[PDB]
Design an enzyme around this catalytic site. Structure first.
Site, PDB file in Angstrom:
ATOM      1  N   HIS A  54      32.584 -34.489  -6.969  1.00 16.61           N
ATOM      2  CA  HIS A  54      32.111 -33.397  -7.519  1.00 16.61           C
ATOM      3  C   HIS A  54      32.920 -33.635  -9.197  1.00 16.61           C
ATOM      4  CE1 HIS A  54      28.666 -32.596  -5.389  1.00 16.61           C
ATOM      5  NE2 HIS A  54      29.836 -31.225  -4.420  1.00 16.61           N
ATOM      6  N   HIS A  76      24.872 -34.310  -5.039  1.00 16.47           N
ATOM      7  CA  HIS A  76      25.068 -34.578  -3.214  1.00 16.47           C
ATOM      8  C   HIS A  76      24.044 -35.145  -3.124  1.00 16.47           C
ATOM      9  CE1 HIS A  76      25.872 -30.164  -3.196  1.00 16.47           C
ATOM     10  NE2 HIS A  76      27.201 -30.930  -2.684  1.00 16.47           N
TER      11      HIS A  76
HETATM   12  C1  LIG Z   1      31.725 -25.029   8.646  1.00 18.11           C
HETATM   13  O1  LIG Z   1      30.567 -25.185   8.229  1.00 18.11           O
HETATM   14  C2  LIG Z   1      30.015 -26.367   7.755  1.00 18.11           C
HETATM   15  C3  LIG Z   1      28.232 -25.923   7.861  1.00 18.11           C
HETATM   16  N1  LIG Z   1      28.527 -25.838   6.299  1.00 18.11           N
HETATM   17  C4  LIG Z   1      28.216 -24.131   6.860  1.00 18.11           C
HETATM   18  C5  LIG Z   1      26.473 -23.394   6.347  1.00 18.11           C
HETATM   19  C6  LIG Z   1      26.025 -24.275   4.832  1.00 18.11           C
HETATM   20  C7  LIG Z   1      26.816 -25.330   3.946  1.00 18.11           C
HETATM   21  C8  LIG Z   1      27.060 -25.330   3.714  1.00 18.11           C
HETATM   22  N2  LIG Z   1      28.327 -26.849   2.642  1.00 18.11           N
HETATM   23  C9  LIG Z   1      28.982 -25.857   1.783  1.00 18.11           C
HETATM   24  O2  LIG Z   1      29.139 -25.385   1.715  1.00 18.11           O
HETATM   25  C10 LIG Z   1      29.336 -27.511   1.101  1.00 18.11           C
HETATM   26  C11 LIG Z   1      30.350 -28.345   1.036  1.00 18.11           C
HETATM   27  C12 LIG Z   1      30.986 -29.104   1.758  1.00 18.11           C
HETATM   28  C13 LIG Z   1      29.771 -30.230   2.262  1.00 18.11           C
HETATM   29  C14 LIG Z   1      32.630 -29.387   1.768  1.00 18.11           C
HETATM   30  C15 LIG Z   1      29.071 -27.034  -0.978  1.00 18.11           C
HETATM   31  C16 LIG Z   1      28.092 -26.413  -1.252  1.00 18.11           C
HETATM   32  C17 LIG Z   1      26.866 -26.573  -0.894  1.00 18.11           C
HETATM   33  C18 LIG Z   1      25.534 -25.616  -1.802  1.00 18.11           C
HETATM   34  O3  LIG Z   1      25.619 -25.430  -3.467  1.00 18.11           O
HETATM   35  C19 LIG Z   1      29.243 -28.093  -1.801  1.00 18.11           C
HETATM   36  O4  LIG Z   1      28.483 -29.344  -1.693  1.00 18.11           O
HETATM   37  N3  LIG Z   1      30.423 -27.724  -2.579  1.00 18.11           N
HETATM   38  O5  LIG Z   1      30.277 -29.184  -3.147  1.00 18.11           O
HETATM   39  C20 LIG Z   1      28.727 -26.516   4.859  1.00 18.11           C
HETATM   40  O6  LIG Z   1      28.702 -27.712   5.218  1.00 18.11           O
HETATM   41 ZN   LIG Z   2      29.359 -30.670  -2.360  1.00 12.50          ZN
END
Ligand SMILES: COCCN1CCCC[C@H](NC(=O)[C@H](CC(C)C)[C@H](CCCO)C(=O)NO)C1=O
Ligand SMILES: [Zn+2]
Ligand SMILES: [Ca+2]
Ligand SMILES: [Ca+2]
Ligand SMILES: [Ca+2]
Ligand SMILES: [Ca+2]
Ligand SMILES: [Ca+2]
Ligand SMILES: [Ca+2]
Ligand SMILES: [Zn+2]
Ligand SMILES: [Zn+2]
Ligand SMILES: [Zn+2]
EC number: 3.4.24.17
Lengths: 173, 169
Positions: A123, A129
């Site tokens: 990012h 994404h």
């Molecule tokens: C352990 O739980 C796994 C499943 N989970 C938990 C359930 C919700 C989604 C979650 N994803 C994230 O929080 C990520 C991060 C990641 C890919 C590391 C975010 C937020 C997405 C929404 O805007 C991100 O991409 N930031 O750049 C996630 O990976």
């Molecule tokens: Zn992300």
């Protein structure tokens, strides 16, 4: 791959980083290494290099964060969102925030700090994404064991290298 | 000594704390150590007690913070404001933040973590600033070499006993 609105990328190839603070969860060394290693992954396949600041301001400001922390985007506690980071640019841009209501880990136990750090350095570097599930820039953190089968996907390679190209000492296939 | 308006206290003697994050400046155990020392100094004169939570929200949340953070009260850069804390109560109340644009030291070479943590926890426990020069709740930082002689002043004791009492026996 996706990118951000109209291609926010960096203009210079040597970037700076600061880890502004540290997590209860790991020792400082484990933090460091995970970060060193997350940068490396993007370094390896582009012309960018990184360097570490202990004070002052850096392109990429890296911190741990609970709930309300000082930006426009509070964290949600244990679970859901695990982290967030910002597209290239000044100030808050470039920057990377880890939810400390997660459990950051050196292995597969809770939330892997390396894996995530990689994602969010995608990012800070201009990537958004992916649609590709198999790509690091997909918005899910997957059920993993082998951290030795961390390689970036082709989608990842393709997107960071459409921003920046490949490494200067590298041949192309 | 002095207290806050409408005398905010804890309505309970067993208090919990959480060290929410850690400073680049110092080893983690040097952080922890300075905390439990700052706690101890008040515990030795009241019927208070502390325990450490690693998860959940604890009564006193302790954290490091730079400029704009969780609250309406940004830190300021190097020097000036070193840290701040909130009077007893729920939420952010009870809680202590530290300006990480200081250099926290275990000694007196930069900004001593123990000293400031102690003053701040005084705040978290119900004490405002004192008029007494010799008091820990006096608002003024010395760069105080002789921690080796460190005592709670009689003022600090007076004020914290007026809130919570002396030790049981
Ligand atoms: C352990 O739980 C796994 C499943 N989970 C938990 C359930 C919700 C989604 C979650 N994803 C994230 O929080 C990520 C991060 C990641 C890919 C590391 C975010 C937020 C997405 C929404 O805007 C991100 O991409 N930031 O750049 C996630 O990976
Ligand atoms: Zn992300
Ligand atoms: Ca979360
Ligand atoms: Ca930045
Ligand atoms: Ca955590
Ligand atoms: Ca509190
Ligand atoms: Ca300051
Ligand atoms: Ca500092
Ligand atoms: Zn944030
Ligand atoms: Zn604050
Ligand atoms: Zn004060």
């Amino acid at each position: 791959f996706r990118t951000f609105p109209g291609i926010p990328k960096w203009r210079k190839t040597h970037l700076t980083y600061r880890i502004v603070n540290y997590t209860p969860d790991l020792p400082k060394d484990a933090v460091d290494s995970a970060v060193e290693k997350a940068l490396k992954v993007w370094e390896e396949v582009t012309p960018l290099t990184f360097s570490r600041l202990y004070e002052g301001e850096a392109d990429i400001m890296i911190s741990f964060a609970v709930r309300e922390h000082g930006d426009f985007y509070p964290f949600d506690g244990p679970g859901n969102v695990l982290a967030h980071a910002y597209a290239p640019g000044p100030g808050i841009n470039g920057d990377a925030h880890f939810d400390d209501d997660e459990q950051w880990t050196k292995d597969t136990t809770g939330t892997n700090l390396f894996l995530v750090a990689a994602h969010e350095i995608g990012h800070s570097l201009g990537l958004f994404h992916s649609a590709n599930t198999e790509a690091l820039m997909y918005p899910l953190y997957h059920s993993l064991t082998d951290l030795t089968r961390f390689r970036l996907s082709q989608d990842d390679i393709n997107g960071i290298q459409s921003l920046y190209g490949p490494p200067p000492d590298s041949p192309e296939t």
